[PDB]
Structure 1
């Protein structure tokens, strides 16, 4: 009966050192008109590239694909929790021509909320966490969209 589609800026940060990996998030939620329980799917992508004067180049990409239950608390607030899979791809080119690329999948989970300040508008805020090998990647998301 109702769908909400939001998009915004996402920012990841891993165990200390990889700095801030920037990007975006999209979410699609569905609700019934006569039940407070629905579902929400999320797509997050962040990245960062570090080049140089030397020549050494490195590029990190993070993908987060999650889904879970969403619960409407009142006409202007809802909360949700999501689980799924995180994917990271690290590229490194060591001057002048050595190239080494590694990728792996890991478990991902998250939780968020949505507010409806106007009935057809949504403000979305969530946090997502992924493990991937032994590196804990945490991402914060602030989005906006429409409920139709």
Structure 2
């Protein structure tokens, strides 16, 4: 078997891709004892706030669980479709309105991409998109790290 040890930074941004909201990442899955079959785990954690001069004071955190396998077509690369849900319950934490009416989910989906590994280097990507009504969310995650 193998364990592809990856992690890195992510930007979950919504309503207009402009927001550094990430924290850390770790991806860690097991590989099969016959086929070249792996599994691919996204985990996101958002713990950034964004001042400038307006008052975007990012309350709450997101939590986002997306999953799928990874398998080769013949023997070039291993990529697959991955699917999940994203839950965040934010609030405007400046203007005299506080939490308005927040609470919804979005079914995150996209593809999970995994690169040709090394003996101490891995390169893993997820790109997940969700919608809430008429606000898109996009989240990319870098999985850089090792493999053994």
TM range (shorter): 0.7 to 0.9
Choose 63-72 or 20-29, whichever is displaced more: 20-29
Could you tell me how far apart the structure 1 residues matched to 2:55 and 2:16 are?
24
Judged with a 3 Å threshold, the aligned counterparts in structure 2 of structure 1 residues 76 and 144 are, in CA distance, closer, same or farther, namely farther
1:68 Cα offset (Å): 0.3
CA-atom RMSD, angstroms?
3.2
Contact persistence 2:118–2:146 (CA under 8 A): no
1:79 Cα offset (Å): 1.6
Choose 10-19 or 27-36, whichever is displaced more: 10-19
Contact persistence 1:130–1:138 (CA under 8 A): yes
1:124 Cα offset (Å): 0.9
Choose 82-91 or 119-128, whichever is displaced more: 119-128
Choose 118-127 or 96-105, whichever is displaced more: 96-105
1:60-88 superposed Cα distances (whole Å, 9 cap, x missing partner): 63322111011146788422321111112
Could you tell me how far apart the structure 2 residues matched to 1:54 and 1:11 are?
20
The TM-score with structure 2 as length reference comes to 0.75
The TM-score with structure 1 as length reference comes to 0.75
1:11-70 superposed Cα distances (whole Å, 9 cap, x missing partner): 122232763433333222221142022322211123543458787844363322111011
Contact persistence 1:8–1:144 (CA under 8 A): yes
Judged with a 3 Å threshold, the aligned counterparts in structure 2 of structure 1 residues 96 and 137 are, in CA distance, closer, same or farther, namely closer
Match of 2:123 in 1: 123
Contact persistence 2:49–2:56 (CA under 8 A): no
Judged with a 3 Å threshold, the aligned counterparts in structure 2 of structure 1 residues 75 and 13 are, in CA distance, closer, same or farther, namely same
Match of 2:56 in 1: 56
Judged with a 3 Å threshold, the aligned counterparts in structure 2 of structure 1 residues 117 and 76 are, in CA distance, closer, same or farther, namely farther
Contact persistence 1:45–1:61 (CA under 8 A): yes
Bigger strand fraction: 1
Choose 130-139 or 87-96, whichever is displaced more: 87-96
Mark the runs of 5 or more structure 1 residues left unpaired by the alignment: none
